[PDB]
Structure formats: C-alpha cells, structure tokens
Design a protein around this ligand. Structure first.
Ligand SMILES: Cc1c(O)cccc1C(=O)N[C@@H](CSc1ccccc1)[C@H](O)CN1C[C@H]2CCCC[C@H]2C[C@H]1C(=O)NC(C)(C)C
Length: 198
C-alpha cells in the first residue's frame, strides 16, 4: 500500500481485541489512542503537542495490527481527539515517506526556504496545515486558530506563500505562530508528491 496525502492517511487498526481507525502520523514520535480499554500495567506520562500537554496512560509491549501488519510497542492512552500511529510503530511496519525515500527511525526533517530564510521543518502526515514558528513573512494575514493535541494556539494565516521544501517548490497557505517545531502539513506535502509507503 502506497498512500498519497490528499486526504488524511487513516488506517484500520486492531488493538486489545477492538477495531479502531487511526492516523498514520510521521509528525508524532509516539502512538496515542483515545480513551479505550487496555489490559495490564501502565505508567503515567505527559505529552506535548501544538497547544499544550495532555496526561496519558502509558502501556508497553502492546500488540497492534495496523492495516494488517503486526507491531508491538508502547501505546499511550488519553484525551486525544484522533487516534494517531506515531513513528515508534510506523517503523515497525516498514513505513516510508517518498517524494528521495525517507525511513522513519528519526524525525523526517527537511530544509525549507521561505520568505528568503532557511529553516528546518518536519514532514508531518498527521497535520492538515503547515505551521511555522514565529518568523518574518511579507504581506497581509488573517487571524486564525488551530487545535493540536494540547489544545489550541493563535496563528497568523498567510496565503499563497512560496516554499522550497527539500528543493521542490510549492505554493500554499502557511500558518505562523507559537509552535515548537516547524511543520510541513498535507496542504504542501501533496504538492511535492509525498507518499506514505509500507
Ligand atoms: C502526538 C505527538 C507525540 O506523541 C510526540 C510529539 C509530537 C506529537 C504531536 O502532537 N504532533 C503533531 C504535530 S505538532 C508537534 C509538536 C511538537 C513536536 C513535534 C510535532 C501531529 O503530528 C499532527 N497532529 C495530529 C493530531 C494530534 C491530536 C489533535 C488532532 C491532530 C492535530 C495535528 C496537528 O498538530 N496539526 C497542526 C496543524 C496543529 C500541526
């Protein structure tokens, strides 16, 4: 299965005897599931996203069958609004990002050029939008608000912005705000021909 990114990359997963839909998320280090019944021991953990932090129950060595491929690893359970499969499990199912091929044992970071400036950014199949840390951009913007796993942040929305992502040019909407990492989301990933393969 090669997966393009014009829509959210959702898969069916089977975990703890239950069927769920989950988001293949190259932008997430961890795997976080909405509140669900999981058996066994767990440890309290705290995880941050765009917007702040949530408390989660951490379960180790959990079997999960992702789109018909089995993996065992750590699953976090908490107040996430989308089930997300993060890199700790994506690597186990041989997931790659293609546009160069990119494995997922490390964060898929790329160099971008935008508004004359060079930045590092995360290729994030779990993000609908592109969000960049505070930076000087030219032109008008529109007040906007985006939600992450931790809640919401205020961003400035800039439309039809030119970005060169790993030497491929795209034009699209970029959001600017208090994100801790520069995020290249699906609105731009599609333009550089990014696919998810496993
Ligand atoms: C879930 C997770 C981890 O377990 C570990 C590290 C980060 C994250 C995490 O939340 N990553 C996010 C990118 S934002 C980010 C923030 C800090 C570091 C790296 C990425 C996801 O990849 C995308 N993330 C997946 C998903 C998270 C729960 C809320 C609904 C979406 C929201 C979406 C998102 O945030 N979209 C933006 C437009 C705001 C970028």
């Amino acid at each position: 299965p090669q997966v393009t990114l014009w829509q959210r990359p959702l898969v069916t997963i089977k975990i703890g005897g239950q069927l769920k839909e989950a988001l293949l998320d190259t932008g997430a280090d961890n795997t976080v599931l909405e509140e669900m019944s999981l058996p066994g021991r767990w440890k309290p953990k705290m995880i941050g996203g765009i917007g702040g932090f949530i408390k989660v129950r951490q379960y180790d060595q959990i079997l999960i069958e992702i789109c018909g491929h089995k993996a065992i690893g750590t699953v976090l359970v908490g107040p996430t609004p989308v089930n997300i499969i993060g890199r700790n499990l994506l690597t186990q199912i041989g997931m790659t990002l293609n546009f160069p091929q990119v494995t997922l044992w490390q964060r898929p970071l790329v160099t971008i050029k935008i508004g004359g400036q060079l930045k590092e950014a995360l290729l994030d199949t779990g993000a609908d939008n592109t969000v960049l840390e505070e930076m000087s951009l030219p032109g008008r913007w529109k007040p906007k608000m985006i939600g992450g796993i931790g809640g919401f942040i205020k961003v400035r929305q800039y439309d039809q912005i030119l970005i060169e992502i790993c030497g491929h040019k795209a034009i699209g909407t970029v959001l600017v705000g208090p994100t801790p990492v520069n995020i290249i989301g699906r609105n731009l990933l599609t333009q550089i021909g990014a696919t998810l393969n496993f």
